[PDB]
């Protein structure tokens, strides 16, 4: 955690409108990816379970967001939450306008 690559997270979330830090084995992550898929907006996934340095990205996510859980969802460079938070935003119609800000 003293050596967590927060700087790398920051590069990824500045370069991509929607970033979902994910694991392939997780249904909450699958539901989060499907939501953006269904919205027909571009999104980047980072499948931490498939990456040699996945554990380092998770240390950084813990440092930045305070939880070592997946998914961790970023929109327009801002952490918006996990799967529950992202679906709550969408239920209230507030997710799509956040994504839109990337293109303004």
């Amino acid at each position: 955690l003293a050596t967590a690559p927060v700087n790398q997270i920051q590069e990824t979330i500045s370069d991509n409108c929607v970033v979902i830090f994910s694991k392939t084995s997780c249904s909450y992550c699958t539901m989060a990816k499907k939501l953006f898929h269904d919205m027909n907006v571009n999104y980047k996934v980072v499948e931490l379970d498939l990456l040699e340095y996945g554990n380092q990205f998770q240390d950084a996510l813990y440092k930045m967001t305070g939880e070592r859980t997946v998914p961790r969802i970023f929109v327009n460079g801002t952490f918006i939450g996990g799967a529950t938070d992202t679906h709550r935003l969408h239920k209230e119609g507030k997710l799509l306008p956040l994504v839109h800000q990337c293109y303004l």
Partner: peptide
């Protein structure tokens, strides 16, 4: 678009 659906259809 083509790549998204390629990815997605292989997962789901």
């Amino acid at each position: 678009l083509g790549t998204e659906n390629l990815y997605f259809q292989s997962m789901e």
